[PDB]
Design a protein around this ligand. Structure first.
Ligand SMILES: CC(C)C[C@H](N)C(=O)O
Ligand code: NA
Ligand code: NA
Length: 502
């Protein structure tokens, strides 16, 4: 095989893959925790030396594998490098997107549930004291996802949240089951424009927010005012790189799978650059101009930063709607906010489930319908772990969405640009390109990028190896045990797929 119908649809599909919850939730938090402008320099650099090259690399690998009827890494890694271990490493191209999808889709169902409740107007009703304004919404969120009073391991999701999660899964399925061109592409051409429009509107509305405590203006200033005292802080660089990986959907095997449906002769250079650029625009210009400026507007910079450090969902699901509730038509404004998050998340969720679907179709020769339904079944079932187990979400997001993507990014780059050959890879990347990659990026891909990632991983491992063993909560061990099981499961499927070939 299936292919993208038009170039536009391809672009919007890829853009739909990248632009998501990571733009309007993760980014604002990351940028706020790291000192605003101080975070932007490493962010941009990371975008130039990591995001772009890896994006092109994944597009290339994707199309390359797609030409031979393989959209997933287990097979592609083998095409690029002949080895059993290459397939084993390729398993991550399925494990990562699957694990991430498990909790990602659940968070997506959250945005949907909130969108509905805010649309219908069922929300907490605040009365000049910040806590008296935020508390109702904190209780609102906690009641929705069933957060425990103290630090208790069990979550008690409301019936509504559960039902909404089912609906979300259904929507994802209804889109995925129609295929690449008919299902994903069609929806992209609608969801994306809608997304951009809503984002712009929100940006403007938020912009107009001004109080005795501050202005959205001050927030934007805080975000775009350079600070170089933080450039000696490794944590900032690590956070920047992590954000780049997450937002561009790098290391998730999603880009590759999407790229495998691009015709062998079609350009991946300009298309890839456009998709990445669109994402960054949606991230720094749109995402960073909504939450932070609003928080700063009402509570000021210091408090806004504190709120950001408080949590990832605290700014998006609590603070912002609480701020909106204090303005005329603030309930409807909250709805637009959660409808935006839902479309952004939906366009991404379908992208991280596709790798699994593509593997079942290509390697196990399953029909699209069956592949989708089973993928949905697996995700839905596994989701109960994230739904009822506290801290499970964070564990999955860490192992898969943080460490895994970087490790996998390094792995894929090493396999493609080193083992498979640098020149053959470069030639494969530039082939059919409407425009050609700057020569300098050849030396960036072959030397700079892998070294940077390697160093990053080394640093990470050092701090984490001791902490892992000494962790008190059982919920995390359960999660670890289960996801390890998923890995074995996928490895087994790859084994079967391998045997069927012979
Ligand atoms: C896992 C990825 C599909 C996440 C997506 N790139 C986002 O920014 O939300
Ligand atoms: Na998206
Ligand atoms: Na993104």
């Amino acid at each position: 095989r299936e292919h993208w119908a038009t170039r536009l649809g391809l672009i919007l599909a890829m853009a739909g893959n990248a632009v998501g919850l990571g733009n309007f939730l993760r980014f604002p938090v990351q940028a706020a925790e790291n000192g605003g402008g101080a975070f932007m320099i490493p962010y941009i650099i990371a975008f130039l030396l990591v995001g772009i090259p890896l994006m092109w690399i994944e597009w290339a690998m994707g199309r390359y594998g797609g030409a031979q009827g393989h959209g997933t890494t287990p097979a592609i890694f083998y095409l690029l490098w002949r080895n059993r271990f290459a397939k084993i490493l390729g398993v991550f191209g399925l494990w990562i997107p699957l694990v991430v999808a498990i909790y990602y889709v659940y968070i997506e169902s959250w945005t949907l549930g909130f969108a509905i409740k805010f649309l219908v107007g069922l929300v907490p009703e605040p009365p000049t004291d910040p806590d008296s304004i935020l508390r109702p919404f904190k209780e609102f969120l906690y009641s929705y996802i069933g957060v425990p009073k103290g630090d208790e391991p069990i979550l008690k999701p409301s019936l509504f949240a559960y039902i909404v999660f089912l609906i979300t899964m259904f929507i994802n399925v209804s889109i995925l089951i129609r295929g690449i061109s008919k299902g994903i592409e069609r929806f992209a051409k609608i969801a994306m424009p809608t997304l951009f429009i809503l984002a712009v509107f929100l940006v403007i509305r938020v912009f107009l927010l001004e109080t005795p405590n501050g202005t959205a203006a001050d927030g934007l200033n805080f975000l775009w005012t350079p600070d170089f005292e933080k450039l000696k802080d490794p944590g900032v660089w690590i956070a920047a790189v992590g954000q780049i990986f997450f937002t561009l959907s790098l290391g998730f095997g999603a880009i590759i799978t999407y790229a495998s449906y691009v015709r062998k002769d079609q350009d991946i250079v300009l298309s890839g650059l456009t998709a990445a650029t669109l994402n960054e625009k949606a991230e720094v210009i749109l995402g960073g101009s909504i939450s932070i400026p609003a928080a700063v507007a009402f509570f000021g910079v210091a408090n806004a930063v504190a709120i950001a450090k408080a949590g990832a969902f605290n700014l998006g699901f609590i603070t912002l709607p609480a701020i909106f509730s204090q303005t005329a038509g603030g309930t409807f404004l909250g709805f637009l906010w959660f409808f935006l998050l839902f479309f952004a998340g939906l366009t991404s969720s379908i992208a991280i489930m596709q790798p699994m679907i593509a593997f079942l179709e290509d390697e196990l020769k399953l029909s699209r319908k069956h592949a989708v339904l089973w993928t949905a079944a697996i995700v839905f079932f596994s989701a109960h772990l994230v739904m009822f187990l506290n801290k499970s979400l964070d564990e999955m997001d860490f192992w898969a969405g943080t460490i895994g993507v970087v490790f996998f990014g390094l792995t894929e780059l090493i396999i493609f640009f080193w083992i498979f050959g640098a020149d053959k890879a470069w030639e494969e990347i530039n082939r059919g390109g409407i425009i050609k990659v700057p020569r300098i990026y050849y030396y960036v891909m072959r030397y700079i990028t892998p070294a940077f990632l390697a160093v990053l991983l080394v640093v990470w491992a050092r701090e984490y190896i001791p902490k892992i063993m000494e962790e008190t909560h059982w919920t995390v061990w359960i999660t670890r045990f289960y996801i390890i099981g998923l890995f074995l499961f996928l490895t087994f499927l790859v084994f079967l797929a391998e045997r069927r070939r012979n």
